[PDB]
Symmetry: D3
Subunit: 251 residues, 6 copies
């Protein structure tokens, strides 16, 4: 399992998957939230993917630099950009965001949507990444992450099998193993289709509790300034499935 | 829920050629004989209407008891199964198959001593509004004495998880029957795929959707349709109905 | 699940039994089991009930312990003979085609008779398990002991009715299990399912009849056995209610 | 168990109980919600109680007629009114709201906060009540109810026992029985104090599910106009513990 | 904890407790079941208590000998008998039914209702008791037990606290410890009253699973002849909270 | 929430005179001896510091091993119990009681070969910030060799319900120990009353509050405090720590 194998497998279907099987449908709202903080300056998406968020941002006239480790994901992105009327505002960068190498450039916002931070499989690595994000922010800037909230996510300890989504001729199931000590989720997204085809798309995450994530930020030189349930600024509480957290350079 | 092509027809269409072959808990419940006795006891020894007759799991047991049964069914393939069976049945001449949608019954002058809907058939109509319409049309088809009987999953005793679930339905030597399902406790809908995995590598999916009603609500729907509840059991063998009953069988008659 | 022998477990799983990764495979306690058994073996031969592919037999042979292995499954037995020919100590493993519900070993006696990894529970009834225990007892020498490793229902927290679970993940397949539990007949009846990236599906069915400790102990008494020690595993960790398994040692009764 | 025994017991502590033991802290918000619908005409609260909502409404210059069955609850109300700078705007009525008897008077809003409609132990009785509320609405009028939402309320079937709230020198527990058929909750709120004292305060509800409630409203001649999670108009979904529903006369 | 302390405490309330707090309301049906098996000969109730079943049997003209360890329970029995028109047919015996001592006398039925046999805290003791019951049966005789069925009882592993019953001015709660190895239930029935009154009634049970109980009977010289869910001969299955089992002397 | 009179002190004050008398699961864990052996092994020839020494359930077994112990305690009544026991104990002179709040230790020049907090004592400090401060101070009191040892509930294996719960802790012939608690999974706080109901009609309430930390988080706290983790067990007998371990015992030393 690489930094890359998530992207590699899923690239060509990431955008086609229906409902709960796909990524969350908050592209537009995410773009507004980031854009609302971005002003006229450029922003850095970590793990830009197929640009689910980047393109909505470019529609708002926001320059976005997308770091991505996956060749195949990156190709999807560049394909979509060439067809997008605003593609020129999306700047794809091949690279590993655990070890960003962006030189002089600085950003008004650095964000990681939909568990991207949790794609780095260790607390250390996540602290490194945050510290790096910090160092790329300009005076005003902020760091925005969207993360599963373990409490509200009600994660069975051990192994689990669940129904993700139904289509007319396929089902989307997920088989997974949870290690509540390492705090890791390791899983297969399974697609079963009529007449018997089976496709498996594996992923691993390391998650953090909020109190922990906030201390991680603190070590990174970040301090938390707001926390919501989603990009529409809904109230965050214990039963929130996700959180959106905004951080800024610390005193 | 993102099963964007679901008809009043696609349940039947898919399942017709295996509906009768599925073992144990995978197949329909094994109370055909009982349900026929139950309905028959209620026939003014006269013709009854099965809503969603299917392959005739109930209709043929009724024909064996000398009861005339009109079966309304929306699925071309189920109806083909039913007709193919009737030709071979020694009493098939007592089963009258009707192609049609029972949300919009059109049977003219004919009246019935019993209109029934077994095994969640009524909940196949995906709406409270539609269900009421159907009950009222049932009511209007009953003769003086007549009654309307429904067999329905009882939400309480069915202990339905909120949200999505995945479950083992039945095991065979060379295949498993699983169910993948989505429950919307507000819309009160169950939306699901019955999955059959086989030693080949083969996979067949058979989707279904239900809108369920709670007994208090269902009784109020019957009241709106001009029916009043006359009895309620756990099964067609008249076992006592209580909170932990998985299903109920309810009998309604025209209102005062 | 209508067509289940004493054979169909083995027949199906033999060529993959040894290949399945992590939790999908048999427990990785072969060496420890051998040690545990060897310590009670002395200088005499031991009888493994349902020797299978020799997951425990070969570790025993490595310790210089002679092992007679009873197995009903042609295919399992063939795996065993194949590994024995290749093993440096294969000669110390004695395979025996037979059904251990009806052992027929004549004059031979054993310093230990053991059934690992729920093998005793493969006999689908309380009656058959008693019979087998009685037979094992009658095959022990003076000193001998009878050793079983068994799932502990309490610690195993079995749901009532049907369940479906993820057993293990591989890069290109998943191992699932579909099961039915009958808490009254105390039976577990299941399919181990392997889905692979091809679209291939392989099903491997099994059936167990479990027994609660208090009940198994009574069964042993009726068979002329009395319990001497109980652990959680072959490393002699303390047995308690949340132990997923137990290892019980019985000897002939006074 | 009368229409009366809920109030009779709880009156003298209803307002003193802390946190989750007391009634919800949305009196102000309720008042605002009702007031916005009130226009220039008087409104009718069903089971006004101690005036937790009535008085906030009076602060907004809205005339409130309060119907209540419990002598002791009513006494608490009148006591608070005399002290309240706007007490004269609250009009207490002894009576059973299952059998309202208000003659010619008409209201711009009839409301029932905090499960009050659910105090009537039968679907029949609830329908009568709604029909009667309908007939007391002027032309524009609306009927507002706040009700537990069974889905979001995740009610165990059968008996349960639970912690309600903690004080320095008491605990608030709750012993209850759920009949999922009759859809009734029958309970004792229990206060154990450090003295060795025990007080019990029993209550009964019959709840309805939203789709059922709506159909009841229809039979009463009402139609649903809006539904929220609370009086601040948050969105109502499956996991909403309560709902607030606004109904108006039907076409 | 004695073989006695169950009875001693509960005697004066055993018959007064409402609903689910009381003993099951199947006394009449029990008597009918036992009478049908009784033939012309006398029957022996183990742990007769306050004669919840013995008196209904007397009403059927059946002679009942009742063994009881609890002085106070026995006193309740004798008090009811004197008042009962058929009390003369109930023969109380002070004694411990783990160690019956009835000499020459033989019975057409020996029975233990409502977990009575589970009152002996050990597999050994229970076998002994069965073997003695066997040895007291005449030729035709049968041994009858009513027992909690652990499967259908869905017993939490570990401690629990539940609501047993509700009264207008008291609640019945139960605090409990389950040892799934020893197969023991150890508990306090708790009554809290509006006074400030707390009463604790402790009990212990050792249960057996059916397969195990049947093996026990085999060791005692009994073989199982029929099993129901209750004395009305409803069908026993996994979800049956109790079972009624009828044994007879073995071949 | 509404226990608005909760000090560093009100746990101790209330429980002191029954802390040692409570049976089975209601009392503190019976691992005093084992803790003492574990700590003494790390202790070397310098004094050890117990945080929240309480009634000396661990201190006295240590003094039995000839180890000098300084016990910080905030509770007047607990300390009174401790002093009472020491006077009667053959080795009490080795136990040195200190009135103080270990969130704000003030021990001057003295240094320790071990500083430990047993049975969730560190979690008595109701905040992540306070717990770090306390770890940093412990760090600063350790000599060169020194280690800092904590015994803490492991939330994963503790399987804490989210929200409020009510449970049976222990049973006596004439009293039950129940527990009523509220769990805030965001604040990571447990707040509760231990309730004793007795045959008299008597009610005793003993309230407590914890802030727990997950191990990964606790380690990062230790890192911020200048500590690095050197070993982790499930208990003082060094059994293996895993997901289903109810507690953990963690040893930290000064960082490179
Ligand atoms: N270490 C790493 N460096 C760079 N990209 C990474 C990475 N680990 C994961 N990724 C990429 O980050 C993405 C996580 S998926 C999220 C895609 C996109 N942000 C969206 O919300 O739709 C994938 O495209 C994956 O290939
Ligand atoms: N709107 C509609 N009109 C007519 N038939 C319908 C319908 N919706 C579903 N059905 C049919 O109703 C049946 C439900 S299955 C029940 C079949 C039969 N009553 C039995 O118990 O065996 C299916 O045959 C399905 O095709
Ligand atoms: N009645 C019976 N007689 C003989 N062997 C049996 C049997 N029932 C099951 N078996 C065999 O017992 C084995 C159970 S698998 C256990 C194998 C081996 N002891 C190990 O631990 O790895 C299988 O080989 C199965 O084929
Ligand atoms: N049938 C009936 N008629 C009139 N009032 C009733 C009633 N049944 C219950 N009540 C009263 O309705 C109130 C429910 S409590 C709600 C009080 C107030 N609405 C608040 O939100 O704070 C109690 O005061 C109770 O005594
Ligand atoms: N070892 C023993 N010997 C005799 N009686 C016992 C006993 N252990 C318990 N008992 C008594 O048996 C009774 C169990 S309660 C059941 C009472 C009665 N059979 C009924 O159904 O209502 C109590 O009266 C208890 O005191
Ligand atoms: N902030 C603080 N400062 C000092 N002592 C404290 C404290 N908070 C809690 N305590 C004390 O720490 C103890 C927690 S209970 C543990 C007691 C002892 N270590 C044992 O193992 O048995 C109580 O005695 C409590 O009064």
């Amino acid at each position: 399992y690489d930094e890359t194998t998530y992207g590699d497998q899923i690239a060509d279907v990431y955008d086609e998957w229906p409902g709960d099987a796909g990524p969350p449908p908050d592209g537009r709202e995410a773009a507004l939230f980031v854009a609302a903080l971005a002003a006229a300056r450029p922003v850095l998406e970590l793990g830009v993917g197929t640009g689910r968020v980047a393109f909505p941002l470019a529609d708002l006239g926001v320059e976005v630099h997308g770091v991505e480790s996956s060749e195949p994901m990156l190709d999807k992105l560049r394909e979509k950009a060439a067809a997008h009327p605003n593609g020129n505002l999306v700047v794809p960068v091949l690279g590993n965001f655990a070890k960003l190498d962006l030189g002089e450039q600085r950003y008004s916002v650095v964000f990681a949507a939909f568990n991207t931070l949790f794609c780095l499989l260790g607390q250390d690595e996540q602290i490194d990444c945050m510290r790096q994000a910090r160092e790329l922010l300009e005076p005003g800037g902020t760091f925005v992450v969207q993360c599963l909230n373990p409490a509200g996510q009600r994660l069975a300890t051990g192994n689990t099998f669940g129904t993700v989504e139904l289509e007319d001729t396929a089902v989307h199931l997920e088989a997974s193993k949870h290690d509540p000590l390492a705090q890791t989720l390791s899983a297969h997204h399974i697609v079963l289709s009529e007449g018997g085809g089976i496709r498996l798309f594996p992923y691993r995450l390391r998650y953090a509790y909020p109190a922990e994530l906030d201390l991680m930020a603190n070590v990174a030189g970040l301090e938390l300034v707001e926390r919501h349930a989603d990009f529409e600024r809904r109230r965050f509480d214990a039963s929130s499935r996700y959180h959106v957290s905004v951080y800024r350079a610390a005193a």
